[PDB]
Amino acid sequence: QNECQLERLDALEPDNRIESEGGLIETWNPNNKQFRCAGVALSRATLQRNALRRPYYSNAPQEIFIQQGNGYFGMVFPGCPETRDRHQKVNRFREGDIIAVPTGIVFWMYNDQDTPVIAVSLTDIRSSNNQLDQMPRRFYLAGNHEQEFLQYQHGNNIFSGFKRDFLEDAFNVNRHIVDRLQGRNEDEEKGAIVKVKGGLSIISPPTVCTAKLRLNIGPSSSPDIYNPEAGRIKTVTSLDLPVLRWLKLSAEHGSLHKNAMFVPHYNLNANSIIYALKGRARLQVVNCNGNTVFDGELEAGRALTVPQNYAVAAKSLSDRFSYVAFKTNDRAGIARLAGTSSVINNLPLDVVAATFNLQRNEARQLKSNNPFKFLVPARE
Amino acid sequence: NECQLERLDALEPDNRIESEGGLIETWNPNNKQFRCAGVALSRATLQRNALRRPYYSNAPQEIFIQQGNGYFGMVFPGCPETDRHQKVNRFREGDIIAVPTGIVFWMYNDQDTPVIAVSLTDIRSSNNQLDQMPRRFYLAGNHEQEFLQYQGNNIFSGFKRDFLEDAFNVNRHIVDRLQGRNEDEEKGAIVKVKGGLSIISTVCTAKLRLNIGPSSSPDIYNPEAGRIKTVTSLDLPVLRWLKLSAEHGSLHKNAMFVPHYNLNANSIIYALKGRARLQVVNCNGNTVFDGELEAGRALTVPQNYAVAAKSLSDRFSYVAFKTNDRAGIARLAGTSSVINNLPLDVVAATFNLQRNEARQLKSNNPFKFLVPARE
Amino acid sequence: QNECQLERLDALEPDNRIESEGGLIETWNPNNKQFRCAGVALSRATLQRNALRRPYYSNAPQEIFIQQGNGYFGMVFPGCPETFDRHQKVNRFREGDIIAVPTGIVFWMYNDQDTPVIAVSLTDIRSSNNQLDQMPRRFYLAGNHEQEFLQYQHQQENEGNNIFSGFKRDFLEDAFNVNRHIVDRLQGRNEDEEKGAIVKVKGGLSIISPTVCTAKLRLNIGPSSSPDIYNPEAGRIKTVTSLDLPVLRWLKLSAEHGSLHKNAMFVPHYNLNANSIIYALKGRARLQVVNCNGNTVFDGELEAGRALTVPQNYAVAAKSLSDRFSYVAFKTNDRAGIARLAGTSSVINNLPLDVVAATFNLQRNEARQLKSNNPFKFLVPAR
């Protein structure tokens, strides 16, 4: 099993599109060796104005990033206090939010605004909370469409699998309602995302399932690092969003000015899926044998898998390059290979000299000539 | 792709092993359903004055006492005692006993009613650092272990007698008996104790036992449907280490439990009495099981797969083992349901119903999990 | 699958040697069923006088035993306070030290004295912090040599083999703000494969003797330390767990150091919740290990320099044939638990006398002997 013996990486695009009445779902192939190594599946949902991402659940945790847009979402946590007509908390999500969906939790999204919502979802197949297999699955409560990850295997909602009489007794409702339930009078094209007519009256007035399910890593959050001449990095870990300890997931959001770069570095204990949000960058990632397994442009809308411990560096080719990196641990640590608090920095001067065969003077240069932590401004 | 199951079956044991004092039945762990589940299932019957001789396993065990009453002991390395020995306990019908990974366990029946104990070995456990094959290690006898067939005879027999002579400081005859040398390999795991036994009834204070049968306080009770009792790490903290739990269920004729799925666990449904109709559906709306589950058979329900059941007997009862200590069910109908906790409007839009139709979906059944028979 | 249905076990010397300028790295083949079952890799580094194990990191936890020699070592924990040039803390290590190296942490060693240092490393692949595959990997900051586990994989402008050599010079120049010359050195462009991971430090080195990264990273379990078990006629045992070295709780690793007088043995026993790698340090021993079918999967001599795997729940026993048999056993759990099959705190001792009688078909008085005749706990003296 050398799933992670990756010789060549590629900036990846989705290889399937699934259009529905009120939007679109795009999938990256989970079978590609990059994703299998990473142990994740990647997808991107677009909700048109007044569209509903109908309730579904998955057998693994999801970390979702809101690339664009705002709206409402709900999660159904079995055994939680409610708020005739009772229900669980509907929260608002905002552009640049990271939303945590634990395993098996039903989740839905509504766009009550004019800007299309773009949500990019990481499904943590490798999670220990996934007790099935390494195929990503989605279970839809409703409709008559295939779930996006079916095509990658070798009525369609969960109600459609049961006898009508079972459903009649269990719900104590008429054959007509049951028919609606099982999506009988509905066709594949209506799909996972659906147009809403009168809008949806969702709002006011009024173990941790009362936990915070979402955190913003956009421009209004406190950055981990901000360099007026290079950019900003903000990470969300389980210290910021405690429910992340259950999902064992985290994320990093980054922005780079033109011709600035982030220093070579690696992830101690996590795979990274880097998804390009805006612009283009030159990335290089190297493996344990000094090989250059990736060396090229990553443009908005594409993903690059960076395996744990593989070193990576990026240089922006655009006025701004922004990305969101999904990491398969809740306390993802990076080791900086260059810069203020880097590996060389924290090595005794002399061992630095004996390690790379440099005069003492050159070793000090290697240590201190670069005064910045993670970001380095472009030059003249 | 071990869990891309397109056909479930109601499974019987495919092997029976008779011994002087009883019988052990095993279900095939290589069967695709149990491999998806990450578990193995076995059933032990102890006659009057039968001793289930001490054994251990490299994975957690959860044992349900289907019938009878008796005694059991466990040996926890480095634990204060109570001759001198560790605690011997009583078990009764409907008990769930938790045996942690590697702990030596023995059972005894001192009554006429045969003890019947069904065991779930949690191979997929993080505490199992071997492989996917169930293993049991017997301290004694000269019989093969129940699961060998799916891949002297005791651990002592594999050592030189000189090693054992020096380690125990005893003569060659004691070591010979220790090694099961002269024992006929039909005596087996469960042994008759000629005159019965000499009864005396990070934490060694842990409760190892808990009753989930009728005599206990239920979690759900409906007079014209049945009852549910579940044991989790909340009820029995030691379960926190096994990462296992269990639900005992009873259904009156024509009553049912609502469509539902388990969030975070695989389930093995074992039928205790009577018959039921079960359906389970996968992620694509396909019916992977649609048929009868009678007493003495098991049905695998994978995580996130939905299951529904309707009793065909005056009383249908089952124990469901689950591969998580805090297993959460998500109810698809009834009181505390997914549909219930969606706002009225999203329900309306989701299935395309009028508000009042949605209202009915969320309210026409006010019972939690059990649904009573009709008329 | 059945990587642990082992019907035979081998006491193995390292499988391959890799010589460098200043020492030697010996690896056991991690594709041996034995190690695949255990979920670990085993290696042995030798540092000659004034030799430097150059900085490398791994995608899995390491537990390292100092078999021989004294020296310094250092780790680099991302985002940690410093000391003094400004660096992170460098510690001394002694014979018998267990050094805990967490996943991804850069680690280096220097032999500042004459006797060759010998450090044997358990790399814990089964770990959850390992998110790659079943293959041990090591990542070197410097040099132009292959990483020592590369030879066990069977499968672009590239020269050197270190992590910097894979980046283009401009990235490095920009990244470090240094000239073309320094960058070339970094990438090891002008160094040859034969120089290796362990380098001779010409003038000698210049260093002084001084998420919780302020934690203790080292603990001695050798002859200096206070024994958990001592028997004047049998030998001694010392173990380190997360209870001694709290950081072990992150690695899920522990280690047991043993030493037996001649003809002394340790009682048959099994590990509840850990696989063991027994590495022999001194003298020879007769070991037996039995599986779940009463079979002897190993039955011969374990002598200094060879490693043996005892899978979880397999019973093991040993009788020393040398004036002194000493060993270190690595176990895949920070809180390993053993069940002794014989001696005072034994599984048999904790069963009611009567079930013992009935279990083994013994008279009461014989069951009593089985409990009582051996007054010692784990070690037993020569009869």
Side-chain angles (χ1 to χ4, degrees):
Chain A
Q1 185 81 319
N2 267 63
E3 56 174 7
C4 284
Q5 186 173 337
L6 306 189
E7 55 313 302
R8 212 255 306 286
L9 304 180
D10 301 68
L12 291 172
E13 280 175 322
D15 37 86
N16 303 101
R17 288 170 56 94
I18 304 196
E19 281 161 38
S20 58
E21 173 184 80
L24 173 74
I25 298 177
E26 301 167 281
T27 52
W28 282 259
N29 197 328
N31 300 146
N32 184 314
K33 194 185 183 181
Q34 283 174 245
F35 287 108
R36 286 187 306 206
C37 170
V40 310
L42 224 227
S43 76
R44 182 168 65 205
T46 304
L47 330 212
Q48 277 309 315
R49 171 169 178 251
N50 286 83
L52 213 206
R53 179 67 149 114
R54 289 196 282 189
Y56 70 93
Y57 60 93
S58 198
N59 59 303
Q62 289 157 274
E63 218 191 11
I64 298 175
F65 184 74
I66 311 308
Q67 176 171 333
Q68 167 189 292
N70 305 67
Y72 293 89
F73 78 87
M75 302 193 199
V76 180
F77 290 98
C80 291
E82 313 197 62
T83 81
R84 171 42 45 166
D85 171 71
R86 263 74 68 174
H87 64 262
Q88 287 201 333
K89 173 135 64 183
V90 43
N91 299 78
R92 293 209 94 272
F93 68 79
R94 307 183 22 242
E95 193 168 292
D97 263 354
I98 277 287
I99 304 186
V101 189
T103 307
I105 295 297
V106 162
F107 165 82
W108 56 269
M109 274 193 301
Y110 174 59
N111 186 13
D112 64 331
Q113 304 191 3
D114 296 356
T115 298
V117 167
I118 297 170
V120 43
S121 308
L122 187 114
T123 300
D124 192 14
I125 295 156
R126 60 161 43 252
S127 170
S128 70
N129 293 332
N130 168 28
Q131 306 199 202
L132 297 186
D133 54 30
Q134 261 49 211
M135 260 304 298
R137 296 158 149 96
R138 276 167 174 170
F139 303 73
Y140 283 91
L141 295 196
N144 207 328
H145 61 79
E146 300 195 348
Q147 142 254 175
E148 325 88 283
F149 293 121
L150 197 269
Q151 40 173 159
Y152 302 112
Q153 291 182 177
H154 292 271
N156 291 106
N157 57 218
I158 31 73
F159 292 111
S160 72
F162 303 97
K163 249 175 67 81
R164 282 190 275 222
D165 260 307
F166 267 34
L167 268 28
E168 288 187 36
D169 308 308
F171 280 105
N172 197 46
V173 298
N174 68 62
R175 190 77 104 189
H176 172 242
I177 299 178
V178 166
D179 278 356
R180 277 300 188 268
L181 214 56
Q182 299 183 130
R184 299 197 169 276
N185 300 330
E186 188 171 301
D187 77 278
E188 166 76 54
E189 267 82 320
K190 229 209 182 304
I193 302 180
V194 115
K195 277 283 186 178
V196 173
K197 275 192 166 56
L200 299 178
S201 307
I202 317 168
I203 68 180
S204 61
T207 166
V208 198
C209 85
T210 186
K212 201 195 181 185
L213 267 20
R214 131 255 188 289
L215 184 129
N216 196 275
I217 62 187
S220 78
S221 57
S222 300
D224 303 337
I225 291 174
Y226 173 52
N227 196 316
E229 292 300 306
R232 50 140 60 208
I233 305 300
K234 208 270 193 296
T235 64
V236 61
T237 71
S238 55
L239 307 179
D240 308 285
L241 186 69
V243 68
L244 255 25
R245 97 172 201 94
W246 296 55
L247 289 69
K248 299 261 182 174
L249 288 180
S250 51
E252 178 181 290
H253 182 264
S255 180
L256 287 191
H257 301 177
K258 179 152 197 162
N259 288 147
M261 56 178 297
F262 64 57
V263 298
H265 71 277
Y266 65 88
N267 297 282
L268 280 63
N269 61 1
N271 301 324
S272 299
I273 315 300
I274 304 174
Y275 174 73
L277 284 166
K278 286 194 225 176
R280 305 154 305 113
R282 215 283 232 268
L283 274 70
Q284 304 196 109
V285 14
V286 21
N287 67 1
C288 66
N289 316 107
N291 294 160
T292 304
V293 300
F294 179 86
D295 188 13
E297 179 182 282
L298 176 66
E299 66 192 74
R302 299 198 193 192
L304 179 68
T305 294
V306 182
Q308 172 193 22
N309 287 189
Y310 278 52
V312 60
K315 171 80 127 53
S316 174
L317 308 164
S318 299
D319 177 56
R320 293 293 180 270
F321 173 77
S322 80
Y323 66 87
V324 59
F326 301 96
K327 302 189 170 162
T328 57
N329 191 272
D330 64 283
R331 308 278 298 265
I334 74 168
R336 280 163 294 275
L337 258 15
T340 277
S341 53
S342 59
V343 167
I344 283 74
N345 255 243
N346 285 111
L347 294 170
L349 189 70
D350 223 14
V351 342
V352 166
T355 288
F356 304 104
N357 187 18
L358 301 171
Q359 297 166 333
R360 283 195 180 215
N361 22 291
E362 298 172 302
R364 299 181 190 104
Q365 279 196 236
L366 199 49
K367 276 203 178 193
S368 298
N369 285 12
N370 181 353
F372 307 108
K373 254 184 74 168
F374 180 55
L375 268 36
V376 28
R379 335 104 51 176
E380 273 58 38
Chain B
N1 242 346
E2 49 187 359
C3 294
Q4 188 187 348
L5 313 166
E6 293 297 321
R7 175 211 197 96
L8 304 184
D9 286 283
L11 299 171
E12 307 174 73
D14 67 14
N15 260 93
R16 21 198 310 132
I17 297 186
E18 304 223 331
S19 53
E20 166 173 285
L23 175 88
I24 283 170
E25 301 161 276
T26 60
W27 284 254
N28 196 333
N30 299 319
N31 185 305
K32 197 177 179 181
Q33 304 183 213
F34 289 103
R35 289 214 305 180
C36 175
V39 309
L41 221 244
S42 63
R43 189 164 62 207
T45 293
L46 314 199
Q47 293 305 318
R48 182 188 125 276
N49 291 141
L51 205 209
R52 179 89 155 101
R53 288 193 278 186
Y55 71 93
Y56 62 98
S57 176
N58 63 292
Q61 276 168 298
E62 227 189 356
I63 305 164
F64 182 73
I65 301 311
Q66 157 166 29
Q67 183 192 287
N69 302 79
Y71 298 87
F72 73 87
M74 291 186 213
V75 174
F76 288 84
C79 276
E81 285 176 344
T82 67
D83 74 322
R84 291 153 44 188
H85 49 269
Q86 273 181 19
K87 35 244 67 180
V88 15
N89 294 101
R90 300 236 49 172
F91 69 80
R92 347 141 20 195
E93 192 166 314
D95 267 351
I96 275 294
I97 314 172
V99 185
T101 288
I103 298 305
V104 173
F105 171 77
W106 59 267
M107 270 181 45
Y108 180 71
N109 193 3
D110 61 326
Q111 289 169 17
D112 244 342
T113 308
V115 166
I116 298 174
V118 350
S119 302
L120 186 132
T121 299
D122 189 17
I123 302 161
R124 77 199 318 303
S125 173
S126 203
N127 293 322
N128 166 24
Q129 304 206 200
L130 300 191
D131 56 27
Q132 260 203 284
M133 278 297 309
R135 284 172 179 84
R136 283 166 170 174
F137 306 66
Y138 286 83
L139 299 191
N142 191 18
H143 58 92
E144 297 191 340
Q145 158 260 149
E146 301 89 282
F147 296 116
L148 206 199
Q149 40 162 152
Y150 302 107
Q151 280 182 192
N153 264 82
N154 60 228
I155 28 75
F156 291 119
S157 77
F159 284 106
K160 310 155 47 103
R161 303 187 270 197
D162 309 270
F163 266 29
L164 272 9
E165 279 171 28
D166 301 357
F168 282 104
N169 201 23
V170 297
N171 70 65
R172 202 172 188 83
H173 168 253
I174 296 178
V175 171
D176 279 356
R177 296 288 232 244
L178 191 68
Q179 286 183 133
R181 269 166 199 266
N182 285 345
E183 186 178 306
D184 45 318
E185 18 288 278
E186 268 71 36
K187 219 180 198 286
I190 310 164
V191 147
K192 286 286 277 199
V193 185
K194 298 66 188 63
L197 282 184
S198 189
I199 305 99
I200 319 181
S201 279
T202 195
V203 40
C204 343
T205 83
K207 219 185 174 296
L208 266 26
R209 219 197 93 274
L210 188 122
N211 198 279
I212 64 179
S215 79
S216 62
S217 307
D219 299 305
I220 296 179
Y221 178 76
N222 183 321
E224 286 283 285
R227 72 150 70 198
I228 307 298
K229 214 289 189 286
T230 74
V231 53
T232 65
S233 43
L234 285 175
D235 301 279
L236 190 62
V238 76
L239 250 17
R240 194 168 18 110
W241 292 41
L242 315 229
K243 290 289 180 168
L244 285 179
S245 69
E247 190 175 79
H248 181 288
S250 189
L251 291 181
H252 301 162
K253 191 165 177 176
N254 286 141
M256 55 188 303
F257 66 57
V258 302
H260 72 275
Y261 66 92
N262 301 264
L263 261 49
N264 56 349
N266 292 320
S267 299
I268 306 281
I269 305 200
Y270 177 72
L272 294 170
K273 196 154 192 176
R275 297 174 295 109
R277 240 272 236 193
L278 277 73
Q279 308 176 90
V280 11
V281 356
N282 68 13
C283 60
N284 306 113
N286 290 147
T287 320
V288 299
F289 183 81
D290 195 23
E292 179 176 308
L293 178 68
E294 57 161 319
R297 307 204 178 181
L299 181 81
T300 285
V301 176
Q303 170 184 32
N304 292 184
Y305 281 49
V307 65
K310 181 196 204 183
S311 175
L312 305 176
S313 296
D314 291 11
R315 214 70 125 108
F316 168 80
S317 59
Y318 69 84
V319 57
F321 304 92
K322 292 179 181 176
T323 57
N324 191 295
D325 52 306
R326 300 279 289 264
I329 104 167
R331 289 163 286 267
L332 265 19
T335 270
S336 291
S337 65
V338 178
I339 276 59
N340 272 231
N341 295 92
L342 303 173
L344 185 53
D345 281 353
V346 331
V347 182
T350 290
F351 306 96
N352 184 10
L353 300 157
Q354 327 194 231
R355 310 279 295 278
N356 73 281
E357 260 163 351
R359 265 186 282 265
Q360 294 178 229
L361 206 51
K362 288 184 57 160
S363 303
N364 288 8
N365 179 350
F367 305 114
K368 169 112 89 174
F369 177 76
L370 276 7
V371 14
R374 30 52 181 265
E375 289 167 349
Chain C
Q1 48 164 354
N2 308 309
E3 340 103 30
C4 288
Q5 282 189 218
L6 297 161
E7 301 297 315
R8 161 224 208 95
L9 288 172
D10 286 293
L12 298 172
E13 298 239 332
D15 293 307
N16 299 281
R17 306 159 49 93
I18 298 176
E19 323 226 325
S20 44
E21 171 190 73
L24 180 71
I25 299 168
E26 296 169 281
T27 52
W28 279 260
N29 187 342
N31 308 136
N32 296 153
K33 208 176 172 178
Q34 198 173 358
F35 292 103
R36 264 176 42 226
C37 171
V40 312
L42 224 219
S43 65
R44 189 167 75 203
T46 303
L47 312 196
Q48 297 297 297
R49 155 193 170 282
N50 273 182
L52 196 218
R53 185 110 168 73
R54 300 196 279 185
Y56 75 98
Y57 57 102
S58 193
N59 70 316
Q62 287 167 282
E63 197 178 35
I64 305 193
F65 183 70
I66 305 307
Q67 169 181 349
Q68 176 178 294
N70 281 9
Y72 290 111
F73 74 89
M75 300 190 210
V76 174
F77 293 90
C80 234
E82 298 174 307
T83 171
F84 66 57
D85 182 41
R86 228 158 300 181
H87 51 261
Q88 288 195 358
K89 194 198 313 174
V90 318
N91 293 103
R92 287 222 64 103
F93 63 88
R94 300 140 44 202
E95 291 187 355
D97 272 2
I98 276 289
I99 304 174
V101 182
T103 301
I105 306 308
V106 170
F107 172 81
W108 56 270
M109 273 178 61
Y110 176 60
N111 184 9
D112 75 316
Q113 301 175 12
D114 252 38
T115 295
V117 167
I118 297 173
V120 5
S121 288
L122 188 98
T123 293
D124 186 22
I125 303 168
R126 53 164 14 265
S127 172
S128 298
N129 289 312
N130 168 25
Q131 305 220 169
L132 304 185
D133 47 45
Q134 294 171 231
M135 276 300 311
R137 294 178 172 80
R138 281 170 167 176
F139 297 75
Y140 289 91
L141 305 184
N144 188 13
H145 62 83
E146 287 165 351
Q147 157 261 144
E148 56 268 29
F149 293 112
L150 207 240
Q151 55 180 136
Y152 298 115
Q153 298 184 192
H154 19 269
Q155 61 166 247
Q156 211 292 284
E157 85 93 337
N158 52 304
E159 0 73 17
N161 280 57
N162 61 226
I163 49 160
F164 294 111
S165 85
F167 293 111
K168 296 320 109 203
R169 303 200 218 179
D170 281 10
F171 267 51
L172 268 27
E173 291 174 18
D174 288 355
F176 277 106
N177 200 20
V178 295
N179 54 75
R180 190 56 149 262
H181 179 254
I182 307 206
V183 165
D184 274 6
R185 285 301 224 258
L186 210 65
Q187 308 189 123
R189 288 182 174 268
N190 281 310
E191 170 192 309
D192 70 285
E193 168 96 53
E194 291 172 15
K195 189 172 231 297
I198 308 166
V199 156
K200 275 284 192 172
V201 173
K202 285 239 177 185
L205 231 267
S206 185
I207 44 193
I208 334 294
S209 186
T211 60
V212 181
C213 48
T214 189
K216 224 191 167 189
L217 273 359
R218 185 203 60 82
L219 190 104
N220 200 276
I221 62 172
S224 65
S225 70
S226 192
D228 299 351
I229 297 172
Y230 181 63
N231 191 326
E233 295 306 324
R236 78 170 79 171
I237 311 293
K238 216 278 198 295
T239 73
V240 49
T241 62
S242 42
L243 290 180
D244 311 90
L245 205 59
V247 63
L248 253 22
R249 90 158 188 90
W250 292 72
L251 313 204
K252 310 284 287 177
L253 290 170
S254 58
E256 175 179 85
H257 188 301
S259 200
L260 302 178
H261 303 174
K262 185 171 176 188
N263 285 149
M265 68 186 297
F266 62 56
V267 293
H269 71 274
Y270 66 85
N271 300 274
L272 265 60
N273 65 341
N275 300 311
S276 280
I277 307 296
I278 297 179
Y279 175 71
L281 299 163
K282 183 77 185 174
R284 294 151 34 240
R286 207 220 196 297
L287 274 69
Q288 301 195 122
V289 11
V290 323
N291 67 4
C292 70
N293 310 124
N295 289 157
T296 311
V297 290
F298 182 85
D299 182 14
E301 294 187 5
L302 177 62
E303 95 169 319
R306 314 203 197 172
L308 185 73
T309 291
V310 191
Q312 175 191 17
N313 282 198
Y314 279 38
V316 57
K319 174 170 154 297
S320 171
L321 310 167
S322 308
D323 284 332
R324 203 182 101 235
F325 177 72
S326 62
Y327 66 84
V328 48
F330 309 88
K331 303 191 186 184
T332 51
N333 196 302
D334 61 296
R335 295 289 301 276
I338 83 179
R340 295 171 264 259
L341 273 15
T344 55
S345 284
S346 72
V347 166
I348 272 167
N349 265 265
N350 285 84
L351 299 165
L353 190 65
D354 244 58
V355 351
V356 173
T359 281
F360 296 112
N361 189 35
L362 289 180
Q363 310 183 162
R364 254 199 172 208
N365 76 264
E366 290 170 331
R368 220 171 265 119
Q369 292 180 243
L370 202 46
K371 282 196 176 205
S372 299
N373 291 9
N374 187 14
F376 310 100
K377 195 169 193 176
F378 187 82
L379 276 5
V380 17
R383 79 244 130 260

